[PDB]
Amino acid sequence: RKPPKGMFLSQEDVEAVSANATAATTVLRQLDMELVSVKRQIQNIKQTNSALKEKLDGGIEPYRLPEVIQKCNARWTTEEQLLAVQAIRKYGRDFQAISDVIGNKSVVQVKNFFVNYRRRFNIDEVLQEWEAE
């Protein structure tokens, strides 16, 4: 039925080590090289990666920005509306980013806005222009 377990013997394998007198030591020598060849390439990418880790040194730590803990709100100050209208021109439909920029509006208060003031901020025009980039 099956070869004793831990012995490996393929029909196909056998015909391959027998094909000639030293198909034996041939096939065993391709792999010997096929190995040192992978094993060398491993050290290239070990060094290549090592030098890239060199650059990422210290991380992005000095570039991080403090925490903006500010509570959501009902009122659109005229300031916020303008901030909005500009965010739209730059962000399109990314209500998350838009919300993030205006600082204190919920990701929907935003979408709401999109329909209420749609009227008078020609949000059509604005939106099709963001597309044109």
């Binding site: 039925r1 070869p3 004793p4 831990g6 012995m7 490996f8 013997l9 029909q11 394998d13 056998v14 080590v17 027998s18 034996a24 096939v27 065993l28 792999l31 010997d32 096929e34 190995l35 992978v38 094993k39 390439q41 491993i42 990418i45 070990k46 290549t48 990666n49 890239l52 880790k53 650059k55 990422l56 991380g59 992005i60 570039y63 991080r64 920005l65 903006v68 300031e79 303008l82 901030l83 500009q86 965010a87 730059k90 980013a97 993030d100 920029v101 205006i102 600082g103």
Partner: protein, 666 residues
């Protein structure tokens, strides 16, 4: 087994089925009704039993029927038919019994037996016991042939056969009750000792062995499952098969290592890409912070587009920091899923140089078992006799096996120092021409009805022939002589004035340095009452050592031994002997084996007797004249003492049937 079925088993027969053999003599019964077969079988088994329970006295038809009950002892033509077949074929009253009816008066027919081997002797006894006229012709000046035993002072060692492979259904078991042989068991415990002279640690000892056995089954698998049996026209040997397996084992060792590092790279290269993506992000981030800084310096109050700029870049920045945090995340996983892969490589090697050396001793043992280089054993058939194993512990003859052939010898007409040179067989009889081994001009002619030839196979193979056949042996027979293998194996007997080995140990091995010398002095036996060590030379080595002087050999021997026991625990030996069986002209080797391109079938060919042509042409087809026995002739017990012994019984039966007729097949 025990009871009556014990006997059937101890006699090598199925207790509840009739043999092909029996079918031929009792074709009435076996084609008969089931009920009768059972009656028959019982009678057989029961008689066997009786004989067995007491094999030091002949067992007569009377004495037999005597111990039977009905329904069994009802029909007595049956009992007679049975007891008589059993007697003929040497299942009962063989060996050395005391005759109840001292030998019937004048004798019928005359047979010359070539060689007083065990096969020789056992047949001779049988024939004589059947009241024929028997003479054995022996080239040597002693009986036994390949059962040679060294005797001198108190030293006693066999240079020939030495082991009894278990009493369970072994005819020798009977013989052992009949003759005083001290049988000692063989504590299977055998420590190995590398070239240096250092024991091998149980840790390895067991790795290697177990791998050995694993390798064996492997070959069996290639043979029966993958059908790897021919190879550019030549038949595959066990040797090839073993290499081809070992190679494949080495191959897969690499195959693994490859696809293991091949995994490391694929990962190391994922890490690469991510690191690049990571650098180029710190890049945007650096210079995007700049921009937020510059636009945050425009001090308020600012108009709304300049306020939007600050606000906006601040998102765009925390956005890109999210991203890069999620990447140093991913980075961490991969960097450890890599100390992971470097932690568990797969196996470095298939076997070390020290391993593959010990594995060699295991092969030497196999070469010893088969008396031959594994490169010569048939892959398909090397172990075809693998069912007919005896049961029980293996044994040795503590007082020299020769005690047996000498005992068989007793009461027989034996001509020692008589070298057969020509066998002439014709329609109306045979003549055998021998010479005197001492002065060889001194010639002899023996006339007889039949010749039983127990020449060793080695002898039968000789080129050009040591014995001439007249007429020549048919080509069907002489091809079977080529095809079969006749191996070699040699012993070295070391006699000392003190024990300096572990007395509790029967055998211990020495591990050679190369494959090429795996057989050379590879194993030692502590067997006897005296301080005698006995050392083997098997494999490719045995043949080569025959060309080397005795001193040199005992040299290499003591070396190895000091090597293990300390350079002054080992005295010079009082007495040494070295066998050379391939050289010995009445052996020309040690015992047969199943050479690649042979099969068990050749053994059956060896046993087929020869029937001469007709004298006056158009006269009736003759009687067969020339018969064969010997270790090489018994398909199911090749190369052994019990095997020979049996082949002797066989031919005697067959010859008697021929020349005294068979009253029992009615």
């Amino acid at each position: 087994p025990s009871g009556v079925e014990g006997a059937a088993f101890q006699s090598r027969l199925p207790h509840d089925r009739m043999t092909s053999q029996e079918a031929a003599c009792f074709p009435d019964i076996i084609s008969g009704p089931q009920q009768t077969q059972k009656v028959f079988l019982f009678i057989r088994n029961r008689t066997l039993q009786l004989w067995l329970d007491n094999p030091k006295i002949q067992l007569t038809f009377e004495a037999t029927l005597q111990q039977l009950e009905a329904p069994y002892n009802s029909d007595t033509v049956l009992v007679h038919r049975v007891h008589s077949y059993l007697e003929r074929h040497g299942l009962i009253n063989f060996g050395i019994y005391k005759r109840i009816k001292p030998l019937p008066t004048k004798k019928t027919g005359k047979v010359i037996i070539i060689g007083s081997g065990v096969s020789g002797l056992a047949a001779a006894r049988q024939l004589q016991s059947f009241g024929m006229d028997v003479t054995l012709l022996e080239a040597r000046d002693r009986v036994g042939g390949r059962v040679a035993t060294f005797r001198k002072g108190n030293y006693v060692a066999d240079l020939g056969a030495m082991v009894v492979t278990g009493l369970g259904g072994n005819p020798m078991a009977v013989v052992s009750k009949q003759v005083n042989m001290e049988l000692a068991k063989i504590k299977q415990k055998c420590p190995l000792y590398e070239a240096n002279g250092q024991a091998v640690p149980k840790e390895k000892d067991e790795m290697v062995e177990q791998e050995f056995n694993r390798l064996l089954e492997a070959t069996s698998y290639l043979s029966h499952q993958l059908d790897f049996n021919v190879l550019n026209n030549k038949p595959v040997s066990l040797g090839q098969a073993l290499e081809v397996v070992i190679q494949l084992q080495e191959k897969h060792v690499k195959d693994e290592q490859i696809e293991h590092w091949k995994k490391i790279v694929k990962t190391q290269e994922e890490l690469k890409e991510l690191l690049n993506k990571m650098v180029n992000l710190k890049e945007k981030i650096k210079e995007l912070h700049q921009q937020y800084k510059e636009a945050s310096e425009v001090k308020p109050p600012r108009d709304i587009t300049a306020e939007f700029l600050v606000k906006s870049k601040h998102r765009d920045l925390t956005a890109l920091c999210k991203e890069y945090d999620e990447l140093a995340e991913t980075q961490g996983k991969l960097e450890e899923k890599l100390q992971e892969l470097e932690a568990n490589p797969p196996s470095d090697v298939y076997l070390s140089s020290r391993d593959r050396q010990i594995l060699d001793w295991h092969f030497a043992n196999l070469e010893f078992a088969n008396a031959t280089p594994l490169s010569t054993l048939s892959l398909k058939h090397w172990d075809q006799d693998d069912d007919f194993e005896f049961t029980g512990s293996h044994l040795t003859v503590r007082n020299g096996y020769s005690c047996v052939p000498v005992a068989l010898a007793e009461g027989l007409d034996i001509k020692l120092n008589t070298a057969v040179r020509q066998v002439r067989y014709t329609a109306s009889g045979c003549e055998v021409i021998a010479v005197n081994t001492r002065s060889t001009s001194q010639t002899f002619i023996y006339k007889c009805d039949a010749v039983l030839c127990t020449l060793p196979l080695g002898v039968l193979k000789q080129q050009p022939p040591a014995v001439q056949f007249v007429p020549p042996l048919p080509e069907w027979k002489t091809s079977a002589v080529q095809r079969m293998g006749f191996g070699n194996l040699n012993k070295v007997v070391l006699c000392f004035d003190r024990v300096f080995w572990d007395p509790s140990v029967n055998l211990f091995g020495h591990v050679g340095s190369t494959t090429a010398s795996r057989g050379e002095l590879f194993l030692f036996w502590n067997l006897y009452k005296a301080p005698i060590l006995l050392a083997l030379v098997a494999g490719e080595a045995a043949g080569i050592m025959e060309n080397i002087s005795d001193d040199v050999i005992v040299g290499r021997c003591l070396a190895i031994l000091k090597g293990i026991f300390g350079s002054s625990a080992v005295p010079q030996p009082k007495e040494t002997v070295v066998s050379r069986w391939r050289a010995d002209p009445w052996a020309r080797g040690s015992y047969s084996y199943v050479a690649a391109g042979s099969s068990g079938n050749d053994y059956d060919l060896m046993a087929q007797p020869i029937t001469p042509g007709p004298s006056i042409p158009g006269a009736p087809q003759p009687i067969p004249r020339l018969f064969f026995a010997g270790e090489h002739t018994i398909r199911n017990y090749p190369a052994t003492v019990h095997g020979a012994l049996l082949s002797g019984l066989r031919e005697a039966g067959r010859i008697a049937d021929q020349f005294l007729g068979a009253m029992y097949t009615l």
